[PDB]
RNA sequence: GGGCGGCAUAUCUGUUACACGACAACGCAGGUGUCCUAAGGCGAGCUCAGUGGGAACAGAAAUCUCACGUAGAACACAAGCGUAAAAGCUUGCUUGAUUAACGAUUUCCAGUACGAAUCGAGACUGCGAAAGCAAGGCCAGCGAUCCUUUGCGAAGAAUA
RNA sequence: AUGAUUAGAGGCGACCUAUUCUCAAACUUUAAAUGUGCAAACAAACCGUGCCUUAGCCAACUGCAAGGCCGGAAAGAAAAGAAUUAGAGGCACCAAGUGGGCCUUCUUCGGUAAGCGGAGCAGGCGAUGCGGAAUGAACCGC
RNA sequence: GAGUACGACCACACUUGAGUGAAAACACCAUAUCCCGUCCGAUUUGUGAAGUUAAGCACUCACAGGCUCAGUUAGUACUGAGGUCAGUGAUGACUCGGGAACCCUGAGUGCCGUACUCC
């Protein structure tokens, strides 16, 4: 039964990622920007493997990211999609029901641009789901979510264009 | 030059393949194991002729290559190259060594050979009923290149398949056979009922 | 295509399914093997676990002996049996956990016949006194079995443990996980632990939620009844007294719904009918 | 083997069977071993503590010592012209109760039950009769055993 | 033959090796004389290698996210074996790598020693709510007589 | 599965999925034959709210563990193919030669091979003639 | 006839699709003052009962894949013992015994305890 209220799609979380790529002053400023944006403490993400072309090395903090849930996540998504002018492409949606977009100007999100920091730009990713995804993340009796209960790409697109009234492009690449 | 093959007959050692323990093995002499119209469908060549070894022995890749070349030359000379398909079954996976009785006499790889058993098919040729004597004479001349004793027989199966010649046409007409390249599989009443296995 | 299928025929051929309870996410078998373990020099003398399991709605406390045929439950107590003693709401809070542990200890000691010999603490103080174990007659001993629960400072599993200890049973423990224990100071605040045991935290939250209500999912059944935040502690005290007075009481006291299995003959007949129908179509 | 370490030549001996990996079960923990019991010394590959030497794998002996986590087993070992009673010390995971006296114990119990029935006057179970005896044979279906041409035609492959 | 070469001179893994154990060659393929206050001990969390879907710069490869993933990764170092709510990875606390009354065993074996290892009994401990686990890093990594050298036999008390 | 390996087929050439030709001392799901431990009633094992002791275990004992004591029953090990024995078992003491081995069935490694070098199980010769293979340490018989 | 907690054996129990599920459970679920822990009450911890069987869970099905037990493969392969057996040999068969494996095909798709609860 699709009409069951437990099948309503909700925003599980909004994940904001700023990949500065080099530790030091830039990463500190990026963490401050994320602290201003998300109203909560972010975390530095350490490099996995040394890549010469990017520098990077290993175990070195190269990015700062944060997870936002609840009302703050929804308002942040509203701001980010307002910046994107409520237009997302078809391939921006994953087959797992999630979608995301990049923002190039941190000062475009209604945030003061006092020159103590600079313009960074970031990554917005939102994860859709339904009430019941606890079964695959709880410690006891952990089990797979039912196949039908998953959020599909078409379901995510319909949720986006019904809730936020956005426009899909139906293009590729 | 190369040693006489009488030194490397008789399968005296445990199998000694090329691996991470035996490095430095030269490539086998025989490279392509199919000649003739290898892309011909299973229905095109109903007659299968075997060269069956009657001895437990080793056959060098040089002998295998020479036999395949001789058989191909005869088949293309006394027939067409599109009316047969011969397959070399034995593969040279056993490495021969040369101590080039002294101390530290364990040798280096100098060749490769196929270890062959009694009743093992060495060469199989798919062909038509018109060119059967040509196939027999080509396989006789190719046998002349091999060591030991081999017999040439005509298979009771259709081509390279495991389906008998008498029953192949009836099975195919009834729809009981699946064509996958140059061999066929008798479709079984099992699995999900699809447009296949309905029979 | 273009993506290799990991779960192919060979993958299933070589798969070794885990134990049923592990694949159900129920039992930690390393912990269970260490818990049912005993000295081989004991030659199988009886050993008991205090099994504490908490659901979304109930608290399950059992005294269990491990056996090869299957574990034997000596005594069981439930949170939903507390209404027989006077606990009408909040059957899953810390106070209900303490009461369930007390009830299980009293029932076990009554069944073993040593109830009059071991009284435990009549009045709960929240204070820690070390249990008396072998490692005057010794108290009945069980070891705590929290299962997969996260053992934090103030979890209700330790509420059940504390209730059982005050009930008379000797469960070896340290106060490091009781609510109110100060990790930095390495000291226990017995007043805070007693407040949790009698649910003054629940009473304070109820008062706050009611004040906000005047200004309704939370405490809906508490507020539907005429439950006052100032009567909770007396209610739990009376519950303790009643549980000690008579632990044997509980709550006051075959149509087939299964689907029949088709036989193999019926499965094959259905399959043959289906293939015949497909043949008739084509 | 090229070296003579403690676990030399145990690649297949101290390996677990296919799809039977994992640590010993609770039934192994709960087994009660007594001094004087007959046990089988079978090394569990996944324990690696208190492991017997490869020689004692598959040997049956008598328990002479029980410790809190170990078992003392006496194993016969032939050395030159004599057999030595070797005392090995292993953990209980590498020990199994031996059914080597199961049939003898059953024989003793059956003899005791037979004596009890003979005392009670109960009728003893009928004695089994020998299957080696003669008798009349009445064949329901008789077939001819012979060699046919088809047997030869079949034993030839291809 | 010896010599040169090499080390088959002490020793570890797989194989030869013939489904108990044992088995030769200057047989085959490789190791050892180290390294680690953590890479030892314990508790708790977590899951690995890869694979797809997706997300500014960002691409085959930088981070984020969702699934699938029986281990195809890791476990100092050679090789097996073993291990998935771990034995792997992170993190917290620690010194069980200390003593250990001449306890008893296995391996080589003459049933001698050494080196490694196993089951214990004491003392003082560490981690853990607890059951428990731990006197190093499982299995290779090491050394007689004689000689040298270091530690222990504090202070006090006893008419003995 | 891990390693190799041939060719067609169905969804640039790969890629994917079903197969297909051929393999492994240092691969293996499976798996013999020959083996190899233990047991098969006289210092034992079996039975008993049997009794005593314990500074052993268990919350306790009448439960368990251990030494005993007192009784019982004993095909003395039935019947089902249901063992056999030129079957005195144990325990020492003192010493000799020997510590170059060779051959063979079967299994086996190095070597093109060798009346070559090197192993396993077991029989031989050495140490042994006699009767046979004309002749031969070892083959056949004894 | 079922449920829950603890289990024993650890696929006949797993995996993939679908469907059905009385009661009570179990679970999704609501929430963050206190106990506790996180970048994030996601996990975890505390407090609680407005909704839902949509998931989990349990059953049922599939000429399903695996798994289990058989048959067949096959008295074949291999093998203990024997010959002054055959054969130049490679190797074979024979005599007295033992005896496989995959493919392929048939059947089946958890079972057994302790305690409490619903029918
Ligand atoms: K020839
Ligand atoms: K250790
Ligand atoms: K020294
Ligand atoms: Mg010449
Ligand atoms: Mg050889
Ligand atoms: Mg734990
Ligand atoms: Mg081997
Ligand atoms: Mg094995
Ligand atoms: Mg062996
Ligand atoms: Mg752990
Ligand atoms: Mg000593
Ligand atoms: Mg020593
Ligand atoms: Mg060591
Ligand atoms: Mg100690
Ligand atoms: Mg080590
Ligand atoms: Mg150790
Ligand atoms: Mg008899
Ligand atoms: Mg001499
Ligand atoms: Mg010689
Ligand atoms: Mg002599
Ligand atoms: Mg003669
Ligand atoms: Mg939550
Ligand atoms: Mg919660
Ligand atoms: Mg449903
Ligand atoms: Mg099937
Ligand atoms: Mg034989
Ligand atoms: Na010295």
mmCIF file of N, CA and C (backbone and C1' of nucleotides) and ligand atoms in Angstrom, chain F residues 78-80 82-83, ligand 17:
data_model
loop_
_atom_site.group_PDB
_atom_site.id
_atom_site.type_symbol
_atom_site.label_atom_id
_atom_site.label_comp_id
_atom_site.label_asym_id
_atom_site.label_seq_id
_atom_site.Cartn_x
_atom_site.Cartn_y
_atom_site.Cartn_z
ATOM 1 P P A F 78 30.080 -63.477 24.353
ATOM 2 O "O5'" A F 78 28.635 -64.115 24.539
ATOM 3 C "C5'" A F 78 28.463 -65.349 25.217
ATOM 4 C "C4'" A F 78 27.022 -65.790 25.200
ATOM 5 C "C3'" A F 78 26.390 -65.899 23.823
ATOM 6 O "O3'" A F 78 26.687 -67.131 23.193
ATOM 7 C "C1'" A F 78 24.951 -64.692 25.257
ATOM 8 P P A F 79 27.195 -67.169 21.673
ATOM 9 O "O5'" A F 79 25.884 -66.861 20.828
ATOM 10 C "C5'" A F 79 24.680 -67.574 21.059
ATOM 11 C "C4'" A F 79 23.532 -66.915 20.349
ATOM 12 C "C3'" A F 79 23.868 -66.372 18.974
ATOM 13 O "O3'" A F 79 23.816 -67.376 17.977
ATOM 14 C "C1'" A F 79 22.744 -64.711 20.211
ATOM 15 P P A F 80 24.560 -67.161 16.575
ATOM 16 O "O5'" A F 80 23.633 -66.110 15.824
ATOM 17 C "C5'" A F 80 23.916 -65.711 14.497
ATOM 18 C "C4'" A F 80 23.502 -64.287 14.256
ATOM 19 C "C3'" A F 80 24.513 -63.430 13.517
ATOM 20 O "O3'" A F 80 24.473 -63.623 12.114
ATOM 21 C "C1'" A F 80 23.746 -62.265 15.418
ATOM 22 P P A F 82 30.679 -67.214 14.549
ATOM 23 O "O5'" A F 82 31.073 -65.862 15.287
ATOM 24 C "C5'" A F 82 32.430 -65.544 15.579
ATOM 25 C "C4'" A F 82 32.541 -64.292 16.416
ATOM 26 C "C3'" A F 82 31.924 -64.379 17.810
ATOM 27 O "O3'" A F 82 32.649 -63.536 18.703
ATOM 28 C "C1'" A F 82 30.827 -62.698 16.574
ATOM 29 P P A F 83 33.857 -64.126 19.577
ATOM 30 O "O5'" A F 83 34.994 -64.390 18.501
ATOM 31 C "C5'" A F 83 35.884 -65.484 18.622
ATOM 32 C "C4'" A F 83 36.735 -65.610 17.390
ATOM 33 C "C3'" A F 83 38.021 -66.404 17.545
ATOM 34 O "O3'" A F 83 37.808 -67.797 17.409
ATOM 35 C "C1'" A F 83 38.479 -64.359 16.455
HETATM 36 MG MG1 LIG H 17 29.285 -64.842 20.354
#
